[PDB]
Amino acid sequence: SMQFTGKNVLITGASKGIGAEIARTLASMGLKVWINYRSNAEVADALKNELEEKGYKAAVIKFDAASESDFVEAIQAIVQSDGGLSYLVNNAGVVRDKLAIKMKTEDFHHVIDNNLTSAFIGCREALKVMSKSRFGSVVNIASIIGERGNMGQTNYSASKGGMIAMSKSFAYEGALRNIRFNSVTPGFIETKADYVKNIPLNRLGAAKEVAEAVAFLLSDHSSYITGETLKVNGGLYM
Amino acid sequence: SMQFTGKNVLITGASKGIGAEIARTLASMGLKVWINYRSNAEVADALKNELEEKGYKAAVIKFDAASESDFVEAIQAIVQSDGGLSYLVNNAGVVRDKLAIKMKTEDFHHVIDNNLTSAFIGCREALKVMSKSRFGSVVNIASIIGERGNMGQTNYSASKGGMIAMSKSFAYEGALRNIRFNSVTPGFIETADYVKNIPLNRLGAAKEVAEAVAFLLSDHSSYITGETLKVNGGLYM
Amino acid sequence: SMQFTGKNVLITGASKGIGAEIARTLASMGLKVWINYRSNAEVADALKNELEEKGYKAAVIKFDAASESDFVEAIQAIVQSDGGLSYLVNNAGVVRDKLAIKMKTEDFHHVIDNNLTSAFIGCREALKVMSKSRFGSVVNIASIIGERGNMGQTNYSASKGGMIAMSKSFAYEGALRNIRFNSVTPGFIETKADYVKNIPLNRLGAAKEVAEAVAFLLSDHSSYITGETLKVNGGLYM
Amino acid sequence: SMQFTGKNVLITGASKGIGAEIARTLASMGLKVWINYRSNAEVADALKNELEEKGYKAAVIKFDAASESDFVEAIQAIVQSDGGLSYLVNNAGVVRDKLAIKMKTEDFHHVIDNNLTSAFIGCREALKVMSKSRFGSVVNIASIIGERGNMGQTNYSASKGGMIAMSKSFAYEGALRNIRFNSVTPGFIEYVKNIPLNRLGAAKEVAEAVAFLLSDHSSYITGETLKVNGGLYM
Amino acid sequence: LMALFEDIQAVIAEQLNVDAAQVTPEAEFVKDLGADSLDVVELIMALEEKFGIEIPDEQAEKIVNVGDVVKYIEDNKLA
Amino acid sequence: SSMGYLMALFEDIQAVIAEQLNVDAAQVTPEAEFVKDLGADSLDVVELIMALEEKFGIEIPDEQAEKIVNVGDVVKYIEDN
């Protein structure tokens, strides 16, 4: 388990996969978890029901994390409901990999607009709602690795590298108010043998293993860590 | 100076500053330089005249490097004029600094779209026009800001850190056909608070950035691709 | 309160400072800690008594971590006492700062042999004793100075940059047997105003903040992380 | 040719391979090259003659680059002969790979002592002899990649990572005299499917990268590590 | 059923350099997945080698989407 | 004699300082300061101390050397302890 001075967390794109397990993990550690979804509510509702049945604190909130006004209003609604917001996990990325010569700038815009602007809005609003309290932690999570090998990832890498650098800039901006910003870069996550081939630990990662890395960066245990990128990839990249 | 198997280079946003000095340096080493500009042509024309009067080969070409059709058509026109395009330098970029809490997503998108999507178009088209001849070199002009971040530069750092990582994926896609992709990360360039933290104790000259670009285009870097070359006087290691 | 499948840990150079707080932290999370010291036992005895008085499990063990035979025998003694060794922290190190023009080759060797070869011995013996368990985690305590270098620290930076890279090679060799190797790179830790000016979090780090990052990397919570270098520097280097 | 304000260069481990190609490249670019050899004089003499027969300036000099007195005195002799020393290339590394559990500590110690101490002495003496000129450049070259896979390299990686971090620290100290320090990390120089350029690198491709870092064209570059590996690592 | 689809989806994804999520039954090799001329030939030969079949050129030209080739392969490979 | 020795000692010290700092030996008087009068920077002084240390075969501890500011300080130091 891990220690948290803060009380609640918003997780964008939290209905399924890594996002849902982040919600599950953080709720089991005692945080009230806010499960963001954009379109179909049924999976998010089922997650919220599951977590409450397990004795945890959970709520759902519908909004498009790539929409400035929708995200801003959602955080205002959480602050109204809970009194504040301690923690934020930006996980609303999309993946659409193509060879660059086959990719329209529309396709590139699609991925970058969504992945970078969503993380930008969340980080910006975290500075606003976290600063008075002199306390906060924000984790920016990159997309799971798409294919085997190194092709088709020009908009994936643009998104991921942009996120990591912009997170460092937020780390400077939040530092005096003790608002930390860190990134997590997952490897191949089970969410076969040919993939496991190049992974030193000789297995795909579990979603829970990524979620516990996120939990560490949110937790009090990482209080002197900001502007860092934590790789969770079984040794695939060092 | 430096050895080049290729004959010509397109430099986006080349009318002044670092871009103009890249044009000046590469022209002086024998390349025909294509000077991109978007808006007013007088500064670009004066650079072209300067280089031709110095005995070099230079031409101007107007296009918005953030516009897919405009950039694509410009490279097509160069290929028709010159027979091909050996080299590309993605230098076009803007800054709109401000603390994030005072930054509209508008201010974010503008810098992202202008700085990162332009490099995407240029690198993509370089793959297309350089593949048949199995030869090319592309340099993306990034920044120390994309490596370490900076207060008030969440948008610029996103665009330049995105550029650095994207350039490596282009390096993977062009490598089989000998099309190399590398980035340069200038520090504080003249084009004493600043200078305090610089070990060489001075700002860099635009020429010093231009010669690092020239190295990565040149035959001398023929086994170097997917690299990010720091040109910052020791400010960041 | 973090989860540990393993039961014990050996921390080299653990009498004081960061090493002592690593022992303090890990004992408080239920591990049996072996407190290494090379010469003066009083401070290590006092640390052991402090932990045992708190209801934790601790032991002291005298050896020079730069001596192959001394280190090898000490791990053998721990395996005889405890039945095995789950975890290892290579913390032992010295400084001998000097402008390089004033640095004797012996001054350089002194730091390399004490700081880097010590970590080689410990990492190697960890591979040997944790392999039949197919379980283990090893943390190498490096430094920001091994990542960015520093005036007057050519020898220290060489020893710690070598440690950071060597650790990744151990990660590759231990991965199939689930023996993880990670480094931590602390910044300026309190265990001067000019140096604080450059730290975004605007303070020196607490030894506890290093210890809890080390604990994370040994814990089950980091089970998909190997070959990593965790910065703990308040944003001083990103 | 590449532009050099300085006049001469010392290359440790210069008799063969990459070191010999660095000698050829720099000599062709107008520098007087000092070719270090420790054991075999014949190969170094042949290189010197090859370069002199091409109209270049070249000399041989015998020393063990991991011996403090020997390397210090060798640089002193070059300063006595030429009036100074503008450039230095540290390339005296050895590779002795073994699985860690099969590695004796004396094996680890020997590789790391050779590889790190030689670069340390070279860089330290560069600071001394280059300071009054308020000018200079030093390149530290890592050992080439010698394994298809990721095993057996604990002392290889200790040496390489140690050299890279050392060099950064020397960059801070030398910057007070405009003396630059940079590293070069070659890849597979003559698994090829793991190389994006899909070929081994030529020694000459490493040499010309080294030449750039010595040259005036890299005058604002210090504390950097230049990968020369065909995209093997990015 | 699904096992053959997964198996074929993986080949298509690696051949055409797309993430698997794009390779749905309704996805068209050319229109949606961006296969060019060389890609089509390469993909045909890879599936022919994998499954031990040979597709008549005229019938290959009528395989427009992913479901079409999965159906062709169930019908024609050896049990 | 004691003055004969002084003369010779000062002459050796003067020549070391005059090359190290590239100044004329007539500028190198007992009262001249390395930085203020003889154009030295901080590193020059460190290099000067080392240059003196191995001509005269002595170790000047850092704490001592911090207080050596002018030519006379060097004369007194060698000539003393």
Ligand SMILES: *P(=O)(O)OCC(C)(C)[C@H](O)C(=O)NCCC(=O)NCCSC(=O)CC(=O)CCCCC
């Ligand atoms: P090349 O440049 O010679 O061909 C391009 C061209 C001229 C055929 C052009 O796209 C086209 O004319 N029309 C596209 C309409 C069309 O034919 N659609 C069906 C595409 S062919 C196809 O889908 C077969 C195929 O690839 C099946 C994949 C192999 C698995 C069996």
